[PDB]
Design a protein around this ligand. Structure first.
Ligand SMILES: CCOC(=O)c1[nH]cc2c1NC1=C(C(=O)CCC1)[C@H]2c1cccc(Oc2nc3ccccc3[nH]2)c1
Length: 254
């Protein structure tokens, strides 16, 4: 059981849908973490309480170096407190906007970390994680952290990242995460997702048909990987272990 008096509150880190996030320190260990404050009055005016309990339960159960850690939680009369991992280096999205695109070494490393995290998630029956750059955080050593918990969107999800099977109303499984990995790998190397278009309808047709092109700088190895991940038929997409064994990955991942 934790209490607010167990932590030293620092500067605000951001704004949440239902409160604020603060940099904090556990008084005893002097460990730096993030403390997310959620207002009950706001959580109530949305009827998300049962949803919060579910998301919290998922996160708490997931223990991997490439997944944002939820250390614990507690609450008082008016607020709900989530004791979260602090990622000092911010979002991968922010880094991507700053650099515009990532080199092969950085990309292959990020993909490796994501593949490991996703492989662990799968082993725990956790699938279809929104791994878009904005949901990816960075540790002190620049290690990637999935932070999916809590840009064009259907009811199915993030448009630019939806696989053919989903958009086409068909059945899907964990292979949706391999498609996501291909879209992310492309976006890391290029700076934009592969099926971006003017209209919702155009994007849909682009995805459905798997219509995308590679800029001249994208190497043979990267094209091989992306092309294998972005297969229309889910069964033709490689397994996460095959991603980690891919020669482009073994050559460029640090
Ligand atoms: C770079 C410095 O920042 C951090 O290290 C850091 N660590 C955790 C968070 C964060 N920054 C921000 C968060 C926000 O939500 C708003 C914007 C800023 C929050 C956050 C962001 C993403 C995933 C999160 O993780 C979770 N958010 C939850 C909400 C409900 C239930 C369980 C949750 N787990 C939490």
């Amino acid at each position: 059981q934790w209490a607010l008096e167990d932590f030293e509150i620092g500067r605000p880190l951001g704004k949440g849908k239902f409160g604020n996030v603060y940099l904090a320190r556990e008084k005893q260990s002097k460990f730096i973490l993030a403390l997310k404050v959620l207002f009950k009055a706001q959580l109530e005016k949305a009827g998300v309480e049962h949803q919060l309990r579910r998301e919290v339960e998922i996160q708490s159960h997931l223990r991997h170096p490439n997944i944002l850690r939820l250390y614990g939680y507690f609450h008082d009369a008016t607020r709900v407190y989530l004791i979260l991992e602090y990622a000092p280096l911010g979002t991968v999205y922010r880094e991507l906007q700053k650099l515009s695109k990532f080199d092969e070494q950085r990309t292959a490393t990020y993909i490796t970390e994501l593949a490991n995290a996703l492989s662990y998630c799968h082993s725990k029956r956790v699938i279809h994680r929104d791994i878009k750059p904005e949901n990816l955080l960075l540790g002190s050593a620049g290690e990637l952290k999935i932070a999916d918990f809590g840009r064009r969107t259907t009811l199915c999800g993030t448009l630019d990242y939806l696989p053919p099977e989903m958009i086409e109303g068909r059945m899907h499984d964990e292979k949706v995460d391999l498609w996501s990995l291909g879209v992310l790998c492309y976006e890391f190397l290029v700076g934009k997702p592969p099926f971006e278009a003017n209209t919702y309808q155009e994007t849909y047709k682009r995805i459905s048909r798997v219509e995308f092109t590679f800029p001249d700088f994208v190497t043979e190895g990267a094209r091989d990987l992306i092309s294998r991940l972005l297969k229309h038929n889910p069964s033709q997409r490689p397994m996460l272990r095959e991603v980690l064994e891919h020669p482009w990955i073994t050559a460029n991942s640090s």
